[PDB]
Design a protein around this ligand. Structure first.
Ligand SMILES: O=C1NC(c2cccc([N+](=O)[O-])c2)=CCN1c1ccccc1O
Ligand SMILES: [Ca+2]
Lengths: 233, 88, 478, 153, 51
């Protein structure tokens, strides 16, 4: 579940407008639940409002172990009732073993990011190289693992907001003690369900985050007018 | 003299009021003439009675997806209009 | 409320009781507190447990909380069942509003109010959002109505139907305060419909004209353009989008950026259709039919026919009118039969509202006087019946000739002035009232001072009414 | 002016044909059709009140009985050699026509003139001094001597 | 005091119109009232509203 306040609503509407103006791929999870619902909604709306001039490309990358109804074909399927989202125009589902396995798609996702980041396409203004931006807004282990796999790789261009769960704990501080102090002050109801043997691991994750502060940027609260997403990216 | 030149004054005042509304009332009345001359399948006039016999021929014998597409189109400018209202 | 919430939250027994916290913050108006520390963590949302609190926020006028609930997710059409609508229109519906609805259905009846009287009779004993919108808009809620209006699909139709309902309910004379608020809310939604459709037109023309013609699968049983007409919302039609739609529908196949004199010049010379003088944008027989199909030229042909009919009527009536009908009288009866066929066609394709317009009434009356002149006219070898038939045709010619003023209301130049002409009746009647009073007073006084005991009625009304009437044109009674 | 002339022509044609049809019978002369249909209802705009409708102020010394001399035809007579036309159908007809044209239709033109003068006056000075360009550029362009000698030049 | 703006407001005008029609309600049309005026025993019908 996800809270859709009109500020983040405006930000992601502006984001999908920028992705239509530039002709960009948007990589995402692709399930029916939460933010990807709203991304599929705004993709469908910008598709239905113009119906031409570079119809946009959204790739959902899922795990295949959380999908309830699965059809093995060669023959189009009819998926109905994690549930996949209706409006993502491309889907890729990674093959692995049993059902209850989160964090499977992240390896192929980050390797695809790395390959397009080293892919050369000279018909641009970036000196080729197809520039790549990662966005984080919310919370979870998947967010932090994705940000560190990005910033470990070249061209991460990690952008966060000033509202969320981990976007607040990264936005506020830009050693171990201050990481502990922020993580207990912005997440009150998550620390109780966590052993400290991986909380120190999270401290190591965030210390690997803050190594390259030139590869990370933030959207602030005073900066709340129009075209702030372009001014960030 | 008095009673006719009073009528002149009242006519002048009524023309002074109703003129900025007169164009609106005329182009509101335009709907009815367009919808009586665009409704029927009408040939020119003195032959129309022959076509009336064609309707006698009638008495001699006798969810939609693009709608949802254009309503979904309408919703986008509704959202843009609400954005504009709150932008003012 | 904040003190009670601090006392309710820190009991260390009901920290799992988010429902009690939400109902406590609903009974008070704490929107910001419920946004900040209920819906923040994304920890436990069920999205279907929000129904009784939804019903309470509806019946207690909490528009910001239902905005928050739809912001966090609830399906209206899943929620809004017939039991909910009967509980709203049966229990939560006011009783003074129902009396004003009775008075409005008795004294100001209409199609849409008959429809909403039928549906409110349905639910006090399938488009759910529209019925909830009617419930909220009748009650003059003014702020829950906007929240549900933002969720609807047929938004322009909803705004025009609401403006029509409220402009009808603003005419009920008792409880003038409720009439005032319903009038203000009517003006707000007709402004809203105009300002939405001007955006829908200013982005795309074709899909806006797609919007104008849809009936929303019996919303109220009518159309967006029809609802704008039936409410006399002339500002919605005086805007350039609907006027551009109407002008493009009026010229037909011919483009609008051609001059009119080329069009009427090609009208008079019939085989001239095959030349590069007119533009058919908006092989050769398609040019022929696309010229002779358009409303513009069938109207112009029809008025040329009507002028030729008036000339034939005048010739027959003044210069060739004998005891037996000659050839142009029979041609005249044929043309009147053609006009009668058109009028019975229009009475068939309209029905009972055909008798609403006064022009159709005097139209049928003129046809009746024509056939009465025929049945007086055929009794030959009787000079009195023949003369009476000709007098009947003369007064009928007055009626037929004065119809031409109503014909030429379509013009860009004469049209607005002919429409302006019917706003003068109150000034003309005030003039005739004062002139009749002065005329009667002077006429009876002069007839009484001069003469003595006139016994003839004709020479009473020539000397009391007629000669002081002529003294209006500068006669000075002698 | 053209709106006035349209309404006045429609009323004038209607009254003229109705009066000529009620009074007389089968006029065959075109000049005395257009004198009695168009011309006399036209003069009734200047306050004339068309005459031969009263049947008491009508004499038979201005007729022809058949078109032989200048004068109009008589009203068509009875078998008792009386005028056939009803006064109660021609006196209120002339009264309605005379009200409608001599008073309503002229005082409407006064109102429309007053409204047009009320609009165009703040633009009138601009349009005049825009037109001033053309007269200055036709009287400053040529090398012009005074007029009756110009042909020598 | 000839304070005509105090009487040209809708409250006093509503008071005066309700006092002028008397027992008949104001949201009935006038032609029904004068039609019932000319035909005197027509008072016993459902044409006028006495609210
Ligand atoms: O169709 C028409 N029917 C009659 C009509 C037909 C029968 C009798 C009478 N009448 O006596 O007034 C009038 C009026 C003129 N008319 C017409 C012609 C051309 C353009 C627009 C029009 O409305
Ligand atoms: Ca008609």
């Amino acid at each position: 579940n996800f809270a859709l306040k009109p500020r983040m609503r405006k930000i992601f509407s502006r984001l999908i407008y920028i992705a239509q103006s530039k002709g960009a791929w948007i990589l995402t999870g692709g399930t029916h639940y939460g933010l990807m619902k709203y991304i599929g909604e705004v993709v469908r709306d910008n598709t239905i409002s113009r119906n031409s001039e570079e119809n946009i490309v959204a790739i959902g990358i899922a795990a295949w172990g959380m999908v309830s109804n699965r059809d093995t074909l060669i023959d189009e399927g009819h998926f109905s009732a994690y549930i996949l989202d209706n409006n993502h125009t491309h889907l890729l589902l990674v093959d692995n073993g049993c059902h209850g396995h989160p964090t499977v798609e992240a390896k192929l996702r980050n390797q695809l990011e790395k390959y397009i980041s080293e892919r050369t396409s000279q018909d641009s203004n970036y000196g080729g190289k197809i520039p790549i931006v990662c966005f984080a807004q919310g919370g979870g282990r998947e967010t932090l693992k994705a940000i560190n796999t990005s910033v470990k790789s070249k061209i991460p261009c990690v952008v966060v907001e000033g509202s969320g769960q981990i976007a607040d704990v990264i936005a506020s501080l830009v050693t171990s003690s201050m990481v502990k102090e922020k993580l207990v002050r912005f997440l009150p109801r998550t620390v109780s369900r966590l052993p400290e043997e991986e909380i120190e691991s999270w401290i190591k994750w965030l210390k690997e985050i803050l190594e390259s502060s030139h590869l990370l940027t933030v959207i602030k609260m005073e900066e709340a007018g129009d075209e702030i997403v372009s001014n960030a990216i | 003299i008095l009673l006719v030149n009073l009528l002149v004054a009242m006519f002048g005042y009524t023309v002074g009021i109703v003129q900025e509304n007169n164009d609106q009332v005329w182009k509101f009345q335009r709907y009815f003439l367009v919808q009586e001359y665009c409704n029927r399948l009408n040939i020119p006039f003195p032959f129309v009675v022959f076509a009336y016999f064609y309707m006698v021929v009638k008495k001699c014998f006798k969810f939609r997806n693009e709608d949802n597409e254009t309503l979904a189109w309408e919703g986008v400018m509704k959202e843009n209009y609400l954005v504009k209202i709150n932008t003012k | 409320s904040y003190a009670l919430y601090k006392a309710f939250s820190t009991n260390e027994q009901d920290k799992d009781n988010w429902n009690g916290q939400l109902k406590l913050l609903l009974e008070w108006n704490q929107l910001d507190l419920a946004s900040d520390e209920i819906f923040t963590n994304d920890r436990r949302w069920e999205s279907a447990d929000l129904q009784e609190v939804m019903f309470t926020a509806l019946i207690k006028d909490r528009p910001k909380f239902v905005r928050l609930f739809l912001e966090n997710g609830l399906n209206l059409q899943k929620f809004l069942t017939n039991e909910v609508l009967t509980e709203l229109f049966s229990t939560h519906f006011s009783t003074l509003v129902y009396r004003n609805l009775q008075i409005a259905k008795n004294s100001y009846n209409d199609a849409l109010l008959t429809f909403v009287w039928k549906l409110v009779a349905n639910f006090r004993r399938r488009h759910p959002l529209q019925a909830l919108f009617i419930w909220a808009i009748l009650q003059n809620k003014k702020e829950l109505s906007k929240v549900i209006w933002e969720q609807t699909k047929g938004c322009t139709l909803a705004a025009l139907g609401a403006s029509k309902l409220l402009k009808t309910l603003a005419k009920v004379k008792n409880d003038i305060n409720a009439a005032g608020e319903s009038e203000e809310l009517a003006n707000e939604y007709e402004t809203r419909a105009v300002e939405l459709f001007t955006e829908c037109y200013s982005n795309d023309e074709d899909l806006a004209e797609q919007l104008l013609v849809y009936s929303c699968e019996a919303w109220g049983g009518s159309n967006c353009l029809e609802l704008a007409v039936e409410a006399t919302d002339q500002h919605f039609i005086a805007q350039p989008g609907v006027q551009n739609f109407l002008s493009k529908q009026w010229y037909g196949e011919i483009s609008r950026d051609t001059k009119n004199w080329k069009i009427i010049l090609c009208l008079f010379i019939i085989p001239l259709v095959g030349c590069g003088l007119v533009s058919f944008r908006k092989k050769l027989l398609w040019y022929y039919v696309a010229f002779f199909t358009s409303p513009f030229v069938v109207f112009s042909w029809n008025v040329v026919f009507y002028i030729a009919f008036l000339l034939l009527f005048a010739y027959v009536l003044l210069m060739d009118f004998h005891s037996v009908p000659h050839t142009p009288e029979l041609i005249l009866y044929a043309l009147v039969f053609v006009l009668f066929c058109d009028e019975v066609r229009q009475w068939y394709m309209n029905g009972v509202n055909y008798f609403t317009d006064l022009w159709n009434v005097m139209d049928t009356l003129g046809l009746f006087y024509f056939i009465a002149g025929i049945v007086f006219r055929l009794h030959s070898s009787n000079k009195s019946s023949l003369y009476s038939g000709r007098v009947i045709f003369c007064l009928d010619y007055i009626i037929f000739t004065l119809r031409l003023i109503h014909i030429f209301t379509v013009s860009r130049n004469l049209g607005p002035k002919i429409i302006m002409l019917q706003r003068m009746l109150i000034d003309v009647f005030f003039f005739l009232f004062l002139f009749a009073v002065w005329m009667v007073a002077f006429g009876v006084a002069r007839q009484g001072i001069l003469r003595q005991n006139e016994q003839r009625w004709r020479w009473i009304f020539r000397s009391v009414i007629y000669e002081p009437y002529l003294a209006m044109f500068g006669q000075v009674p002698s | 002016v053209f709106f006035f002339l349209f309404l006045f022509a429609v009323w004038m044609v209607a009254f003229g044909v109705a009066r000529q049809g009620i009074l007389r019978q089968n006029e065959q002369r075109w000049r005395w059709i257009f004198r009695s249909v168009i011309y006399e209802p036209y003069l009734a705009m200047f306050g004339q009140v068309p005459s031969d409708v009263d049947s008491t102020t009508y004499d038979f010394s201005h007729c022809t009985f058949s078109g032989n001399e200048s004068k109009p035809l008589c009203v068509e007579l009875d078998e008792h050699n009386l005028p056939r036309f009803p006064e109660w159908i021609t006196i209120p007809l002339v009264c309605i026509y005379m009200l409608s044209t001599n008073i309503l239709l002229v005082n409407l033109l006064v109102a429309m003139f007053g409204y047009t003068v009320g609009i165009v006056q703040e633009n009138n000075d601009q349009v005049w001094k825009f037109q001033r360009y053309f007269l200055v550029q036709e009287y400053c362009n040529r090398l012009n001597i005074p007029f009756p000698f110009v042909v020598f030049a």
